[PDB]
Design a protein around this ligand. Structure first.
Ligand SMILES: [K+]
Ligand SMILES: [Zn+2]
Ligand SMILES: [Zn+2]
Ligand SMILES: [Zn+2]
Length: 86
DNA sequence: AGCGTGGGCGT
DNA sequence: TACGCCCACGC
């Protein structure tokens, strides 16, 4: 089911999509292709660079349906919304 | 809370 | 392959 395997001796993880294996390899090579223009920190993934930049800009696109409180990431809002339960 | 970052996936 | 979502986990 998951043909693409990690060729690293220490690792044993396997994947179903080659591009996921290609991504995974960066853990071992330590490559971080995506750099924040603001603080020069490097990141392994472009999507994580995007949410990181919001720490600098204060951009918060995700608002709680119940109280309107805003968050930088969707999963932050998700974690928050549940507090309005009983 | 604030956020790094891998997992799985659709496109 | 890249891009960028949700999703989850970790501190
Ligand atoms: K291996
Ligand atoms: Zn590996
Ligand atoms: Zn930065
Ligand atoms: Zn709320």
């Amino acid at each position: 089911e998951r043909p693409y395997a990690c060729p690293v001796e220490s690792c044993d993880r396997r994947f179903s999509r080659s591009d996921e294996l290609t991504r995974h390899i960066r853990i071992h090579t330590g490559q971080k292709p995506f750099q924040c223009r603001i603080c020069m920190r490097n990141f392994s993934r472009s999507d994580h660079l995007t949410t990181h930049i919001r720490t600098h800009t204060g951009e918060k696109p995700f608002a709680c349906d119940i109280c309107g409180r805003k968050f930088a990431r969707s999963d932050e809002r998700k974690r928050h919304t549940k507090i309005h339960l009983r």
